[PDB]
C-alpha cells in the first residue's frame, strides 16, 4: 500500500530504466534497448 496516489498511471508495463511505461510489453522492451551502453563513454559518477 502507497500513502497518496495522484495521478498514478495505469499502465501494463513500465521501463525500470525511466518513468516511461506502455500498454505493449514489446513496446517497452524495444524501448528498454535505448537504455544499453556498448563502450564507457564517461566516467562512473554519482
Ligand atoms: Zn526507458
Avoid: D, I
Amino acid at each position: 500500500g502507497s500513502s497518496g496516489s495522484s495521478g498514478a498511471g495505469v499502465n501494463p508495463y513500465k521501463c525500470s530504466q525511466c518513468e516511461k511505461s506502455f500498454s505493449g510489453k514489446l513496446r517497452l522492451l524495444v524501448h528498454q534497448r535505448m537504455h544499453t551502453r556498448e563502450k564507457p563513454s564517461g566516467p562512473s559518477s554519482g
